[PDB]
Every structure is written in C-alpha cells, then in structure tokens.
Amino acid sequence: FRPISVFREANEDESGFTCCAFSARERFLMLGTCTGQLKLYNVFSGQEEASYNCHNSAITHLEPSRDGSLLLTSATWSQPLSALWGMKSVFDMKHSFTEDHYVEFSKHSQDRVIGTKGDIAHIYDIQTGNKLLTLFNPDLANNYKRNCATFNPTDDLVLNDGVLWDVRSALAIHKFDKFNMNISGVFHPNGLEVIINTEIWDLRTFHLLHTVPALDQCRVVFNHTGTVMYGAMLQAMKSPFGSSFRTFNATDYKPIATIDVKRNIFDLCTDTKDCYLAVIENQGSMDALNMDTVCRLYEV
Numbered sequence: 001f002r003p004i005s006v007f008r009e010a011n012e013d014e015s016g017f018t019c020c021a022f023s024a025r026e027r028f029l030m031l032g033t034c035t036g037q038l039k040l041y042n043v044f045s046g047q048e049e050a051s052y053n054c055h056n057s058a059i060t061h062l063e064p065s066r067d068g069s070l071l072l073t074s075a076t077w078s079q080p081l082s083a084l085w086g087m088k089s090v091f092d093m094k095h096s097f098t099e100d101h102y103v104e105f106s107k108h109s110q111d112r113v114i115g116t117k118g119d120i121a122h123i124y125d126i127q128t129g130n131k132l133l134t135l136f137n138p139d140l141a142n143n144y145k146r147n148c149a150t151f152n153p154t155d156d157l158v159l160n161d162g163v164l165w166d167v168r169s170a171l172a173i174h175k176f177d178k179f180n181m182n183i184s185g186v187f188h189p190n191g192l193e194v195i196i197n198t199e200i201w202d203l204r205t206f207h208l209l210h211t212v213p214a215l216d217q218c219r220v221v222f223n224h225t226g227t228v229m230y231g232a233m234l235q236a237m238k239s240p241f242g243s244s245f246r247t248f249n250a251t252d253y254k255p256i257a258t259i260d261v262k263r264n265i266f267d268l269c270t271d272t273k274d275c276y277l278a279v280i281e282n283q284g285s286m287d288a289l290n291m292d293t294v295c296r297l298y299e300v
C-alpha cells in the first residue's frame with residue numbers, strides 16, 4: 001500500500017467526503033459529502049471537476065453503473081432516502097426509493113436495483129422504477145443492525161438479513177444462523193460462497209468452509225478480479241468504521257495485510273483494473289465540531 005495521492009474537498013474550511021467509488025472513466029473518482037453532494041474529482045491532482053446536490057442530508061453510499069449512464073445514492077435523513085440518477089448529457093433524478101437506507105445494482109445485467117429498508121429487501125425495475133418484489137419473512141429475520149440486501153453475481157439469489165432468497169420463486173431457501181448483531185453478509189464473486197461476518201458458507205452444501213476471526217464486524221469489499229477482499233471493522237461526528245482495514249486472499253481467505261491508517265475510515269473502493277485502493281479517512285475525531293476527511297489513494 002504505497003500512498004500515491006491525497007486530497008481534501010475543494011472550497012471547504014472542513015472537508016466533508018463521506019464515501020467514494022470510481023466512475024466508469026479512469027482517473028475520476030466519485031465522492032459523496034456530508035452536505036449530500038456528489039462530486040467528481042481527479043484522483044491524482046485532487047481537482048474537483050463537477051458537483052451536484054443529490055440530498056439535503058449526508059451521503060452514506062454511492063454506486064455508479066458499469067456503463068457510465070446511472071448512479072445510486074443513499075443519504076442519512078432525507079425523503080427520499082435513496083435515489084437513482086442519470087449521468088448521460090445531463091445529471092437528473094430517474095427514480096427515488098422513499099425509505100431505503102441502502103441500494104445496489106443487480107450484477108450480471110444491471111437492469112434492477114435492490115434496496116434495504118431495515119430488515120426488508122425491495123427489488124425495483126430500473127426502467128419503470130416499479131417495486132417488483134418485497135423479500136421479508138418475520139419468522140426468519142435475524143434483525144441485523146447493519147442489514148444490507150444484495151444480489152449474487154448471476155442476479156438469481158439475494159442475501160437479506162441472513163436469509164438466502166431465490167428471486168424467481170420469491171422463496172426463502174435458507175436462513176443462516178445468527179452469530180453477531182450487525183453484519184448480514186455478502187456473496188463471494190465466485191458464485192459458490194457466502195461470507196457472513198466470520199463465517200464462510202458453501203451455497204451448494206451449506207457446510208462451514210472457513211472461520212476468519214479477523215473479519216469480525218467488517219464490511220467486506222472485493223477487488224474487480226475477485227482475488228482480494230478488503231475488510232473495515234465497525235467502530236465499537238461518528239464514523240461507521242475504525243481506523244484499520246484488513247486484506248485477505250479471496251481464494252483461501254488467508255490474511256495478506258493489516259493497515260492502521262490511524263484515522264477513522266468512512267469508505268474504501270478499488271478501480272476496475274485493481275491498481276488502486278481509495279480510502280476516505282477522517283483527520284478529526286468523532287468529537288470534532290465538524291468532519292475533516294481526506295481521500296487517500298494507495299497503489300496495491
């Protein structure tokens with residue numbers, strides 16, 4: 001992890017970056033801010049190239065579509081809470097998801113959005129904006145406090161609140177047992193495994209394949225080739241994470257590195273070629289009057 005670049009938000013006594021993701025154009029990082037702006041930055045110069053007010057509360061998450069034409073945002077305390085934006089020619093709002101705290105695109109064919117409202121998953125069509133499906137069963141709920149619903153790589157299974165759902169049938173196929181209060185899980189990019197906090201489960205057998213005690217309380221992000229997994233641990237204003245991230249080999253779950261950047265982490269992401277890790281670090285403590293975050297770019 002050799003540091004390659006650092007920048008603060010332009011035109012701010014205090015820098016308010018809260019989350020990031022690389023755009024479909026190399027060199028250009030998309031960042032959300034604590035005032036609910038989306039911003040486009042040159043990741044090398046730190047030059048702000050564009051700006052849009054998406055929400056009147058902080059941005060917690062953003063996801064650009066692979067084809068460069070669409071963007072998902074989530075905010076703290078807005079109605080609507082999440083939204084879908086168009087970025088062809090003009091920046092505009094396409095749809096809004098009135099109480100979803102988190103959203104993702106479908107993975108194989110990016111024609112759907114999955115949104116999370118507490119313990120409930122909503123799937124929407126991108127064209128119509130219609131809610132196609134509500135996935136929720138109160139008898140199978142884990143009530144994870146950081147529940148985030150997600151599609152698998154082929155868009156035909158969903159993980160919501162520790163329940164594996166078959167999208168076509170809208171049937172719960174398996175409830176994974178609850179071993180922590182917060183982390184709900186992700187799909188491995190290989191389509192065969194699910195990572196739920198410290199537990200790695202096989203999707204064909206439901207056997208326990210690995211225990212990874214360093215993944216405890218980590219939000220997991222994969223690189224684009226799916227060879228490496230990055231974990232930032234929940235913190236025990238207030239960042240959602242602590243000041244350390246961990247890397248693991250995605251094939252054998254062996255630890256590669258533990259990096260303490262001595263600054264609470266708000267988000268991290270890789271470019272599509274997996275050359276870079278961009279990390280949003282706060283220079284201020286949780287007690288500061290105001291956030292003062294930087295974006296740090298490291299070469300892996």
Ligand SMILES: CC(=O)N1CCN(c2ccc3c(NCCN)nc(C4(c5ccc(Cl)cc5)CCCC4)nc3c2)CC1
Nearest residue numbers: 018019034058060061062076101102146219240266267
């Ligand atoms: C009140 C105020 O202004 N703030 C400033 C901004 N702050 C931020 C900054 C970054 C966040 C983040 N980044 C990682 C994903 N983009 N993820 C998230 C969420 C999350 C958290 C833990 C896990 Cl296990 C999984 C998901 C909550 C729903 C979106 C994802 N919440 C965040 C909140 C809140 C306080």
Ligand SMILES: CC(=O)N1CCN(c2ccc3c(NCCN)nc(C4(c5ccc(Cl)cc5)CCCC4)nc3c2)CC1
Nearest residue numbers: 025028038039040049050051052086087088089090091
């Ligand atoms: C490849 C390369 O060299 N570049 C050089 C610099 N570049 C630029 C320069 C200006 C842009 C602009 N106008 C507003 C600038 N003040 N709007 C846009 C739009 C946008 C995107 C995000 C936000 Cl949040 C707000 C507005 C409008 C349609 C979506 C893009 N994208 C821009 C890209 C990136 C590519």
Ligand SMILES: [Mg+2]
Nearest residue numbers: 005006044045
């Ligand atoms: Mg620089």
